[PDB]
Design a protein around this ligand. Structure first.
Ligand SMILES: [Cl-]
Ligand SMILES: [Cl-]
Ligand SMILES: [Cl-]
Length: 124
């Protein structure tokens, strides 16, 4: 079974580019990260910052998670991110995604020791 931290890494980290380069970024990344294997993951955000910078958010601003949990943290600075969401013509096994690049604060739910990100709650 994948650990919660490794699943967060695989689903939400893309430190290799500073930003989505084209409209096809999400189709490629969602496939590359195995988020379209058995079904199309509907929504998924990738963060274009170092893993260290993203893990550091766990010691930044403590804020409530949407679900009411109290282990969420909001990054003090904005980060380069890309939101990937299925378009209307998306249909497994032919997933299709809209790519939206933005610079915003990220909110992550953190847990464990080391205390690291295990869920991407939202961006602001
Ligand atoms: Cl791990
Ligand atoms: Cl995988
Ligand atoms: Cl997400």
């Amino acid at each position: 079974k994948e650990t919660a931290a490794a699943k967060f890494e695989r689903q939400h980290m893309d430190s290799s580019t500073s930003a989505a380069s084209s409209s096809n970024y999400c189709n490629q990344m969602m496939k590359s990260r195995n988020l379209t294997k058995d079904r199309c993951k509907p929504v998924n955000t990738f963060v274009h910052e170092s893993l260290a910078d993203v893990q550091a958010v766990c010691s930044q601003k403590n804020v409530a998670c949407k679900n009411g949990q109290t282990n969420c943290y909001q990054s003090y600075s904005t980060m380069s991110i890309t939101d990937c969401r299925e378009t209307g013509s998306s249909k497994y096994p032919n997933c299709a995604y809209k790519t939206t690049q933005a610079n915003k604060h990220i909110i992550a739910a953190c847990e464990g020791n080391p205390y690291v990100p295990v869920h991407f709650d939202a961006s602001v």
